[PDB]
Enzyme design. Structure first.
Site, short mmCIF file in Angstrom:
data_model
loop_
_atom_site.label_atom_id
_atom_site.label_comp_id
_atom_site.label_asym_id
_atom_site.label_seq_id
_atom_site.Cartn_x
_atom_site.Cartn_y
_atom_site.Cartn_z
N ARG A 123 0.85 -1.21 0.00
CA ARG A 123 0.00 0.00 0.00
C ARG A 123 0.87 1.23 0.00
O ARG A 123 0.63 2.18 -0.75
CB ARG A 123 -0.87 0.10 1.25
CG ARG A 123 -1.76 -1.08 1.49
CD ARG A 123 -2.62 -0.90 2.77
NE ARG A 123 -3.38 -2.12 3.05
CZ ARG A 123 -3.13 -2.92 4.09
NH1 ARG A 123 -2.21 -2.60 4.99
NH2 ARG A 123 -3.86 -4.01 4.25
N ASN A 160 -12.10 -4.28 -4.37
CA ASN A 160 -12.68 -3.87 -3.10
C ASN A 160 -13.21 -2.50 -3.46
O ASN A 160 -12.47 -1.53 -3.46
CB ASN A 160 -11.63 -3.81 -1.98
CG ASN A 160 -12.24 -3.48 -0.59
OD1 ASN A 160 -13.28 -2.84 -0.51
ND2 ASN A 160 -11.56 -3.86 0.48
N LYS A 166 -1.69 -12.20 -2.80
CA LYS A 166 -3.04 -12.77 -2.68
C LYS A 166 -3.04 -14.26 -2.88
O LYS A 166 -3.60 -14.97 -2.06
CB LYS A 166 -4.03 -12.10 -3.61
CG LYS A 166 -4.40 -10.71 -3.18
CD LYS A 166 -5.31 -10.10 -4.21
CE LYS A 166 -5.68 -8.68 -3.83
NZ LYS A 166 -6.51 -8.60 -2.59
N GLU A 190 -2.97 -8.33 -13.22
CA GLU A 190 -3.24 -9.30 -12.15
C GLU A 190 -3.96 -10.57 -12.64
O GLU A 190 -3.57 -11.68 -12.25
CB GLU A 190 -4.04 -8.67 -11.01
CG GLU A 190 -3.36 -7.55 -10.27
CD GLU A 190 -4.19 -7.03 -9.10
OE1 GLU A 190 -4.80 -7.83 -8.38
OE2 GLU A 190 -4.23 -5.82 -8.86
N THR A 204 -4.22 -2.32 -14.30
CA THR A 204 -3.52 -2.99 -13.21
C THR A 204 -4.21 -4.33 -13.00
O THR A 204 -3.53 -5.35 -12.82
CB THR A 204 -3.55 -2.18 -11.93
OG1 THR A 204 -2.88 -0.93 -12.14
CG2 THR A 204 -2.84 -2.92 -10.84
N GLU A 262 -11.51 1.51 -3.54
CA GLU A 262 -11.38 2.25 -4.79
C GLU A 262 -12.04 3.63 -4.69
O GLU A 262 -11.46 4.62 -5.15
CB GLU A 262 -11.87 1.40 -5.98
CG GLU A 262 -11.00 0.12 -6.19
CD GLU A 262 -11.43 -0.84 -7.33
OE1 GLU A 262 -12.34 -0.53 -8.13
OE2 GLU A 262 -10.82 -1.93 -7.44
N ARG A 308 3.84 1.41 -11.74
CA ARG A 308 2.62 1.32 -10.96
C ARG A 308 1.71 0.24 -11.51
O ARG A 308 1.22 -0.62 -10.76
CB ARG A 308 1.92 2.69 -10.89
CG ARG A 308 0.46 2.67 -10.43
CD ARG A 308 0.24 2.12 -9.04
NE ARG A 308 -1.19 2.14 -8.70
CZ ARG A 308 -2.08 1.19 -9.03
NH1 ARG A 308 -1.71 0.11 -9.72
NH2 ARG A 308 -3.35 1.32 -8.66
#
Ligand SMILES: N[C@@H](Cc1c[nH]c2ccccc12)C(=O)O
Ligand SMILES: N[C@@H](Cc1c[nH]c2ccccc12)C(=O)O
Lengths: 250, 250
Positions: free
Chosen positions: B16, B194, B168, B240, B236, B198, B157
Site C-alpha cells: 500500500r 474492493n 493474494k 493481475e 492494473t 477504490e 505502478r
C-alpha cells in the site's frame, strides 16, 4: 517565454513566472530523492563493484555524461537556457538546428558553474534530504537517476541568472556601464538584491514544503529554506555578477 | 520493501505504502508535462524535421529506446519491479549482477503491457493534461523527456499488480487454485476488487490535485480521477488476472 522571440525572454514578469515554476520542479525532485539513503558509493570515483569498463569517474558521472551526449545529439545544448555538466563531451546535433537569435552576450556559454553546483549538491544537499546514511546496494541506479533530475533543475534555475542580468543591463545601460567599467562588485550586488522580495520567497517556500507530497487526508521546511538561502540564491548572484563583469566584451 | 528480502515484498502494508508513494510521483510528473503543448510530431513515426539517421520510429521512440539500452547496462531490468518498453533492445549488464531471489512466478517478465500503456498515454492522457493543442517546435526534447518520466512511473505502478497478485495467491492457495484451474476470470475479478477502497482512492486523488503545485499564498481533479478510474486501475487488474491465469506454470 519563447527563446525565438527576444521580447518574451527579457520580460521581467515572464522571468518571475519561470522562476516560480522551477521552484515547484525543484521541490518535487527533492521529494523523489528523499525516499533513498545517502548512497556515498554513487559519488565516489572508481568504486569497487560500481566500476565501469574503461571509465574513470563515479557511477553518477557515467550516467550523467552519457545522458548529455545523447541529448546533445538531439539539440539540447543549442538552447540558451541549457548549460552542460560535461562541455568537452557534448556532440553536434544530427537534426536540423533551430536558429536561436542571439539574446545573451556571446560569451554566455562560458559562464558555467556546474562544477560548483555538482559539488555542493553532493556535499551539502544530499545529507539534508536523504532518508538515512549509508549505501542501499539495491538502489544505486534509482538514486543516480533521481540525482540527475535534481542537478538539471538546479542548474537551469541557477544559470537563469544570465537572463535576469541581461534584462537589468538593458533597462539601465548608463548605470550598469559605470559599475562594469570600474568593476564595482559591491555596487552590482547592491543593485541585484531586493531583500524584501527574498524574504517573501523564503516564506512561500516554507508554505509549499508544508503541503507538497503531504497526503491531504516529505521535506523539512527549515532545510528547504536553508538550501535556497545558502546555496540557490547566492550562486545565482555569482552567475549574475560574472555575466555582468564581462558584458563589455570579455 | 527490499527486493532481496521476499517477506518485505509480499507484505500487503508495504505494498500500500509503495502504491501511495507512486501516486504522488505520478501526480508530480503529470504537472511537469502539463506546461507543454500536445506536440503531435513527437509521437509520429518518421516525421520530416525530426527524422533520425537510420532509425524507423518516432522521436519519442528513439529517446526512450536509447535510454533503456544505457540503463540495461547498469542493471535496471534485472530488478523485478522494472518492465521494459523495448524488450528486444535491452543489453546485458557490464556490472556484477545483483542476485535477486525468485519472488514472482518465472514467466513474470513475459507479462508486459507497455505497448498498451504507451498507446493510451499518447491517445488519451496527453490530450487531457497538455496546456494546448499543436506543436511547440522549440520544446520537442523537453516534452519527450517529460513523457519518458510519466511512462516509466505508470509502467511501474501498473506492473506492480504482479506483486499484489502473488501476495493474494500465497494467502489463499486453495481458493485461487480452483479459480485458476477452471479459468474463472469473473471469479478472479470479484476477488481482486474492493469497491470501498477504490472510492477512497479517488477521493484522496481529488484532494491531492487540489493542493499539489498550487501556490499556497495545475491539474484538474476531474481528469486525474478519470485517468486512474478509466486507465490505471483497470489495466492494473488486467496484469493481475493474466499473471494469475498462468500461475500453475504457463
Ligand atoms: N532499483 C534498481 C533498478 C533501477 C531502477 N532505475 C534504474 C536506473 C538505472 C539503473 C538501474 C535502475 C537499481 O537501483 O539497481
Ligand atoms: N527545450 C529545448 C532543449 C531541451 C531541453 N531538454 C531537452 C532534452 C532533450 C533534447 C532537447 C532538450 C528543446 O526541446 O529542443
Amino acid at each position: 517565454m519563447d527563446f525565438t522571440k527576444p521580447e518574451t525572454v527579457l520580460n521581467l514578469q515572464n522571468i518571475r513566472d519561470e522562476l516560480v515554476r522551477m521552484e515547484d520542479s525543484i521541490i518535487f525532485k527533492f521529494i523523489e530523492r528523499s525516499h533513498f539513503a545517502t548512497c556515498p558509493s554513487v559519488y565516489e570515483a572508481n568504486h569497487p563493484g560500481l566500476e565501469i569498463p574503461n571509465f574513470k569517474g563515479s557511477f553518477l558521472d557515467w550516467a550523467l555524461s552519457n545522458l548529455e551526449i545523447a541529448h546533445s545529439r538531439i539539440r539540447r545544448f543549442e538552447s540558451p537556457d541549457e548549460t552542460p555538466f560535461f562541455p568537452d563531451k557534448i556532440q553536434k546535433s544530427f537534426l536540423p538546428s533551430i536558429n536561436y537569435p542571439q539574446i545573451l552576450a556571446p560569451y554566455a556559454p562560458e559562464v558555467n558553474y556546474n562544477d560548483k553546483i555538482k559539488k555542493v549538491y553532493i556535499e551539502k544537499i544530499i545529507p539534508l534530504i536523504s532518508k538515512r546514511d549509508g549505501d542501499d546496494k539495491n538502489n544505486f541506479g534509482s538514486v543516480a537517476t533521481r540525482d540527475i533530475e535534481c542537478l538539471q533543475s538546479l542548474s537551469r534555475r541557477i544559470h537563469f541568472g544570465k537572463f535576469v542580468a541581461e534584462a537589468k543591463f538593458q533597462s539601465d545601460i548608463p548605470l550598469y556601464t559605470k559599475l562594469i567599467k570600474s568593476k564595482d562588485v559591491e555596487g552590482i550586488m547592491k543593485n541585484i538584491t531586493n531583500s524584501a522580495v527574498e524574504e517573501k520567497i523564503l516564506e512561500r517556500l516554507t508554505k509549499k514544503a508544508e503541503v507538497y507530497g503531504v497526503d491531504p487526508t516529505r521535506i523539512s521546511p527549515e532545510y528547504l529554506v536553508k538550501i535556497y538561502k545558502e546555496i540557490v540564491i547566492p550562486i545565482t548572484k555569482e552567475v549574475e555578477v560574472e555575466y555582468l563583469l564581462r558584458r563589455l566584451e570579455e
